[PDB]
Design a protein around this ligand. Sequence first.
Ligand SMILES: [Ca+2]
Ligand code: NA
Length: 259
Amino acid sequence: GCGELVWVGEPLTLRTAETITGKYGVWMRDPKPTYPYTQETTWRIDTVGTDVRQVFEYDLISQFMQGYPSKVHILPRPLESTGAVVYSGSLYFQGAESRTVIRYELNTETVKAEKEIPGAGYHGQFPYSWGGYTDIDLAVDEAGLWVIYSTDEAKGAIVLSKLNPENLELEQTWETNIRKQSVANAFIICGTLYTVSSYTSADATVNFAYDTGTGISKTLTIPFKNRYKYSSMIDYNPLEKKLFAWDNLNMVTYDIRLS
Ligand SMILES: [Ca+2]
Ligand code: NA
């Protein structure tokens, strides 16, 4: 079940990009897989450049780890940065040079919804500390779909909103006290937002928490290792109960333990 994060394991490298295009990126699985996909289906996006549109899809974990894609989707619009997620059959991603989140149904290659995140900074206003236009970070946890961002009104502090996954309407919004550009990335577990302290250090920590259920903010000191010294993407998968990350060409995963 659910609980507070109390431990992160060592990063395990599952695949390594072979070109500069994959220096940063996002890779993910669907915590609520829908036909024709399964819990093994993996998606990979190498996100260096200004016209990122190729989504690599693998039917099997074995193919993701050793082979070519089983299918490539070409997005109808270029994608921004590393914050995207897959949820219940759709890729949720941010349009380049925009504050728009797009719901792209993977099995039909159809855009089903688009939504400006109200007031969200974009394109280098409130990125995480490494930059990379990481202003807007989607997240899936045990309760469904979220987006992590900030606004002028929040003065750059992390804001997070629960999202309706069908039409992308904002359902509830919380404002933390954590300056988004002062942390390396963030993710949500069991309704609690966690941040990572550094994207370069082998001795980083999960250093802040904000619990949306209680409104309480905490400091933490849970060790977190950036094995390759440049983590551009850190998300949580609530089906696997693992962190998925992209660290300097390497697609890695971390075990976790909850209280
Ligand atoms: Ca994240
Ligand atoms: Na994300």
